[PDB]
Symmetry: D2
Subunit: 384 residues, 4 copies
């Protein structure tokens, strides 16, 4: 279960670089130089790294400092063969973003947010990024009067449409991925789930430029089934990026290493990514717990990739097992994939086997055999 | 706070008619004749009633029995002036639907589900219904192997497209509203939130024929903010129907009377419906608790309408209060409603006030004044 | 992973016998004769069965019918070697219990509840039961005025004290186990968690007669950590019975087979039961999903036991692995088990190494190595 | 609704003094001098203030700095008439506490935690505090192997027993209150609810010295009913302190002002505190949202007290309304308060009206009238 760069495992600089400050706690680790993170990740078998603007270039840097920070990072990438497939903007840390970036009630802050994003898009393209993530973690409210959501969505659409006009004006090939989260740090966040983000994208001027960046833990903070939401994103053709981690239920955003939290959900996720031929980076957005020293940071990062590769092996074994394939037929997964009425509406209306002569009791008596199928899945997951 | 039929309050026959059977309990009330429910609701000031097929006509009825049941119900409507603005199909009670209707793995069950729906659409139109709700409460899974979600969504789209071809072929004016719910009775339900249902509708062949029917409690079973989701539905032009009730958090579907559960959320909901000029029925999907006798059933139904009218008065008083209007300006709700960059992209890029000369510290220091605004809202809600 | 009766696996008659009625659904299976359930469970390797009064003897039975039902069940036990280690009273199904049994507002219902319990205690003792479970599923409220909780707890204490006086008066060896659940079917249930039940027991007249019967899914319906609560019960000496099943988070009570739901929590649970030498029955309180026919019922029951035995093997391998034992020392689990201040208070107060000369920075810099330990645990669970 | 110091409203220095740093955000406000907070709170009508050690004296202060900080705070108290009814130790911010204080796996950290607590107990007594709160926010785990919970509870008991021996040795009148929280910042926190803390206290060497300090939001982060838990604490005689705030469901700890979040729960809470004659401080543990400037901080604090006084008035009006008193009798709240069997066990066993001649159908048919009672409660809350 040794990763190599051809598994396309990627990590945010902010993941391994998290210093361990939490709502109730000071930092437990020193800050990492991005160069060290690139080196250590490469050595673990990662393929690439991702960044917010402010992770690579300290906020408020001079042009000379900006150039120096980028030069050093570029050297580390050259030294290791690491890629930068994705970048993003920090529109949440600085106090000016306390009511949002794109949907801030103050118009001047909205304009600033757009300008800060556009500056970093240019940098992302320079570094070879194919995807630009937007996480509107400050977009939302704690109270009902504070944010008229229809006006906020107008602002959000205006922002995304301006960024799509910008990338089109420059001829860039980069696409956007909107990352949903239901709450935290705002009491409620706008576009709180994969569904809401998909729906919003369809109202943009150039929808083809936008997809989603779903995170395991974020959909689980609403008690939703993450594999199901990923299936709907894939169905829509919108899975442009993914954040892999773990989460134990409905609580604060834990960002556990991938495989921790809901292990069975992790199994079904990998099964779906691999069966669907998802071709994007397997990106980890996780925090090594603050209990850990640096050795533990790298152990946690390595465990992300290990767990993905173990799950990949088990899921593949499940699907290739002739006994599973029989069980799938016994549970009529083959019939689920057939059209209901390829014969057309009038044929269905005239088909007496569909209503007047349908034996509902006989059809109701047929067991679905899902428990046997699921115990096969359990036995494969556990290697039993 | 006395309702009259011109408040457009409506109730499902299954609401007041719930006999009180729960996962762990037998019925505590006798079944109601739909005629009695129409009469009693009319007397309380309701405007109309809604029905599943199987609430009005017992499942398996002969054609003569069907005609008799409809004749009696039509007489009650004529006697009272009650309307039937919405109908729906029961695709969840009968054991044949144990794995779904439209997304059942068995193809024969999918076809049957469509035929049962189309029969009831014809009846709904006969009774004057403008909206047809679909609640896919059996569409989903308890286990990961049982349901390939992409194939299930293909089936779901096929079903909805066939029903849209049917209503178009008949020249009916009726529209569809998809009702999301995240879980219960299935471990996870497909299209689990307002967002997912909105996104799915955009992939239908005739999207204009479909909207959502969001329920207060259902979005709250995912810990989501119901007013926010209603705002996104209104933003999309998709709020075709609404189910009003109460819910205490993330748990089984309680279906409390409206106003119970999250009272502040109820306030913000009414504020939004009324400010947006929502013109559909104020439909209650609630269960009088099984502790209640029939007197308590009608008291609970009356309380639904009372609470809506009290909230309406308080919300209107909030928005009309000059002190609130001042507070709204102090919190920059007026600026949220202004375009970010009506000057256009190039003008924003060239505007040094948006970046190079933006005083981020000064903008960060400006308080949003949201707590004062929210205490005004509290004082108006409580009549303090 | 083949169970035998010496693993002490037990099942409620209501588990495998669940007909599949849910809030929104009719039965999908026929009722089982208890004799058939005893036979089929025995054949799967179960050790025993448990019952509510009303599962073994239909409610309202004559004395002759009662005797016949018990005679047939006794013959099945004799035929198979099955035991009956636990029984319980149904104080939730009948409409008379709509506001509770022991804490019903109506005094006559409280008295009836006690008399129905005492009748079944006598039967439980006749059948050899060592434990009598009380699940107060109707004790609680949907609304704040309906139940004065302090008066309800007085009533609950009075009930339990009367049942303890009864068993003492008869010389029975049976003990009570109170089963917590946080909600469902009541909006909130009294004694909603293991903690609340433990605390309540300490106020009973004969606390030694009462423990807890924690259920995996019930503590997970409050988002709590089930292994932690079981550890507190074991710490208190109060783990008199356990209900094993699965649950996917904060939602309605799913009662999945054991191993489903939170698999990692299941692993840590088995590790704790086995390490602590828990000697009670491994009782499953699960519902075979209503999608299943009878074949699937028995497959689901078999999977309960299989998953326990796989987890037992993996947990034992974890604890016996010298690499894990090293990792445990590296994370200072050995120091957690040492007394903080066996030297006593004055010695601690005078110990300058504990404060004045404690190097807090050096102690803060030491990583806990928990991620490496947890990846060892993951690798053992998965057999990697 | 103007508070005066005789309503006994108190605030933590850390509440109004919160600078607005969150998991994803820098501070939005400058630090407050405790003297300014005392002054501003006094002016709003507060009665007192509470503190962690490290809020009053910066961590690592010299003895001269410690004396100066305490002298200035004492002058502010003298200038205003403010009291200090409660104090607490910060055992969570400093990195040395990353795995806990009292239950840290490192024994040296446990000893340090005790010494830091005992130093502050002496200071609390000097300042007149009657209650000392312990919040074990770092006691717990993110992973199953990291913390053997039975050994951690042994350590926790040892710590609390040593602190009780200390206060007894000094002749202090101060008592302890343990504050539960279910998670955050640890993945799961030990003693996660009011129930678990009550149960644990009964195993201490001097239980009479310990009670609970329940927080509105903390029990709501487990989806529990806060009024119910407060009723159990009052029933046990253990409500030694309370933290008042708001929370919107199962999510991160919001610490909204009191009255925000679950408003109906706030109403039932005040009703219970006032009806039970709770005599402790009405302490607010809230965070003015980081959107706010200092003006908004004081507005938020004022709103805490206003909302309590509005709820107090409405609850009192409810209980004094003859129509409510009639409704309470109609719902048999008077019978709930009567003993079930003051006649004794043998009399109940011989009472044929309790079983053999009990008309269960007649008792089941009697409605509880809870909806009418609850609509009265709603109408009183809203002043309708
Ligand atoms: O910018 C996108 C990233 O930003 C932040 O670090 C969020 O916490 C993380 O979930 C997100 O993936
Ligand atoms: O058909 C739509 C209706 O069906 C059922 O009764 C559902 O429980 C309810 O939420 C839904 O509104
Ligand atoms: O009587 C105790 C048993 O009763 C019921 O069937 C409950 O649903 C179950 O959780 C409980 O274990
Ligand atoms: O010390 C007790 C106090 O400490 C912290 O500030 C906690 O966050 C708060 O809930 C608690 O009341
Ligand atoms: Mn996250
Ligand atoms: Mn992320
Ligand atoms: Mn509902
Ligand atoms: Mn509904
Ligand atoms: Mn259960
Ligand atoms: Mn159980
Ligand atoms: Mn809190
Ligand atoms: Mn607190």
């Amino acid at each position: 279960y040794q990763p190599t760069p051809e598994d396309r495992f990627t990590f945010g600089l902010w993941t391994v670089g998290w210093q361990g400050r939490d709502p109730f706690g000071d930092a437990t680790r020193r800050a990492l130089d991005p160069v060290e993170s690139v080196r250590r990740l490469a050595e673990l078998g990662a393929h690439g790294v991702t960044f917010h603007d402010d992770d690579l270039i300290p906020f408020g840097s001079s042009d000379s400092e900006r150039e120096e920070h980028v030069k050093r990072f570029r050297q580390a990438l050259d030294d290791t063969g690491m890629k930068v497939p994705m970048a993003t903007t920090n529109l949440f840390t600085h106090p000016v973003f306390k009511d949002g970036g794109f949907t801030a009630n103050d118009r001047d802050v909205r304009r600033y947010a757009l300008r800060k994003t556009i500056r970093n898009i240019d940098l992302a393209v320079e570094l070879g990024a194919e995807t630009y993530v937007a996480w509107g973690g400050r977009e939302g409210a704690e109270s009902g009067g504070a944010k008229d959501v229809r006006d906020a969505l107008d602002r959000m659409k205006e922002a995304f449409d301006l960024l799509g006009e910008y990338v089109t004006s420059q001829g860039y090939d980069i696409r956007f991925a909107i990352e949903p989260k239901p709450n935290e740090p705002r009491g409620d966040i706008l576009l709180p789930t994969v569904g809401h983000a998909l729906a919003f994208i369809e109202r943009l001027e150039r929808p083809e430029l936008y997809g989603v960046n779903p995170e395991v833990g974020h959909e689980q903070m609403a008690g939703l089934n993450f594999p199901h939401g990923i299936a709907q994103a894939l169905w829509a053709g919108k899975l442009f990026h993914i954040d892999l981690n773990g989460q134990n239920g409905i609580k604060y955003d834990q960002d556990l290493r991938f495989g921790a939290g809901d292990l069975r959900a992790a199994f079904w996720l990998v099964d779906l990514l691999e069966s669907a031929g998802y071709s994007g980076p397997r990106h980890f957005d996780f925090k090594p717990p603050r209990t850990e020293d640096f050795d533990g940071v790298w152990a946690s990062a390595a465990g992300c990739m290990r767990n993905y590769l173990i799950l990949k092996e088990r899921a593949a074994a499940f699907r290739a097992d002739p006994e599973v394939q029989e069980a799938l037929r016994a549970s009529r997964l083959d019939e689920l994939a057939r059209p209901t009425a390829a014969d057309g509406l009038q044929a269905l209306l005239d088909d007496r086997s569909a209503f007047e002569e349908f034996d509902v009791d006989a059809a109701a008596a047929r067991g679905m055999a899902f428990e046997r199928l699921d115990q096969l899945a359990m036995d494969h997951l556990l290697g039993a």
